[PDB]
């Protein structure tokens, strides 16, 4: 939900959310940026 509106042109997400996403992941999923990253990649890649 947060990835789709904070997306602009698909796989081009501004750092403001590149982290905001990573952090919500790092928070909601409690995934240390390590875990969060893999996810950030999948979300951006998929949501792209």
């Amino acid at each position: 939900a947060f990835g789709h509106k904070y997306s602009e042109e698909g796989g081009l997400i501004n750092e403001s959310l590149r982290d905001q996403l990573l952090v919500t992941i790092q928070k909601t999923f409690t995934y240390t940026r390590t875990q969060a990253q893999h996810l950030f990649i999948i979300l951006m890649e998929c949501m792209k």
Partner: peptide, 22 residues
């Protein structure tokens, strides 16, 4: 109240990012 809902969603995101920085 819809404007309250949108603004408080932004306030929670800013507070969460501030906690991660701290």
């Amino acid at each position: 109240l819809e404007e309250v809902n949108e603004r408080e969603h932004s306030m929670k995101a800013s507070l969460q990012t501030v906690d991660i920085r701290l």
